[PDB]
């Protein structure tokens, strides 16, 4: 999963990005577990 | 104001055991992933553990793994880390961290650190 | 993994002087931090995702790069710059550190 509007949907390592733009918000992952 | 204050930081034995506590405080807590950051007496710096918010998950560098629990306790504010069968490169300052404030963050930094707590393991 | 390689350890400049740090990475990395630190506390965050400088640090500072090179610049160094610096990438998990640079004033 690449992008969500839900946090832990991510399963990122890291504490992820969270883009937010009218009130909403979306949650990108920029530490990628390879 | 974001403070992380750590303690329980002490002398053990080869192979002993001991709890690391921080203290967070001035945001909320629950809202954020915590870390675990250690620097040795190379003044080497290591991430040694992660605790997301939302669910549990947690992670381990390797040399660690099976000795070390990180966890939280979001009713009291705090980070822990249980440390056991220790070893004497486990010697070093811990410091817990988090992410930087909002506009600094997002990208995998370590945007505030406590004053950090002393482990030393020896006889 | 992305294990990472500073250069030079030790840098000495004048105040006044231009400095660049440097900090390789064993593969390609999207963002790189780097912390000060002096003695007897933490490291300070000082610059975030590359090339932001964190709230507080002096504008002679800067950083740039990309894929598997990074580096930090002071335009012109101060007598409080003296402290060692780190880089740190978490593009791939897990998180690695650079072991530093120190930064030596001549006077």
């Known amino acids: 999963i690449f992008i969500s509007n839900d946090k832990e949907s991510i399963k990122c390592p890291c504490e992820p990005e969270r883009i937010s733009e009218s009130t909403c918000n979306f949650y990108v992952c920029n530490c990628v577990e390879k | 104001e974001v403070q992380l204050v750590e303690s329980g930081g002490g002398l053990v034995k080869p192979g002993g055991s001991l709890k690391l506590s921080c203290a967070a405080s001035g945001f909320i807590f629950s809202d954020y992933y915590m870390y675990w950051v250690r620097q040795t007496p190379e003044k080497r710096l290591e991430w040694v553990a992660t605790?997301?918010?939302?669910?549990?998950?947690?992670y381990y560098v390797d040399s660690v793994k099976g000795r070390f629990t990180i966890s939280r306790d979001n009713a009291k504010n705090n980070l822990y880390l249980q440390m056991s069968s220790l070893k004497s490169e486990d010697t070093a300052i811990y410091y817990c961290?988090?992410?930087?404030?909002?506009?600094?963050?997002?990208?995998?930094?370590?945007?505030?650190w406590g004053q950090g707590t002393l482990v030393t393991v020896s006889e | 993994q992305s294990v990472l390689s500073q250069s030079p350890a030790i840098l000495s400049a004048s105040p006044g002087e231009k400095v660049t740090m440097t900090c390789r990475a064993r593969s390609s990395v999207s963002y790189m931090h780097w912390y000060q630190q002096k003695s007897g506390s933490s490291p300070k965050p000082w610059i975030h995702a590359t090339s932001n400088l964190a709230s507080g640090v002096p504008a002679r500072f800067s950083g740039s790069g990309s894929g598997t090179s990074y580096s930090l610049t002071i335009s012109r160094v101060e007598a409080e710059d003296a402290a060692t610096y780190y880089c740190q990438q978490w593009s791939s998990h897990p998180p690695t550190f650079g072991s530093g640079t120190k930064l030596e004033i001549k006077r």
């Open positions: 605790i997301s918010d939302g669910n549990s998950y947690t």
């Open positions: 961290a988090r992410d930087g404030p909002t506009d600094s963050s997002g990208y995998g930094g370590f945007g505030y």
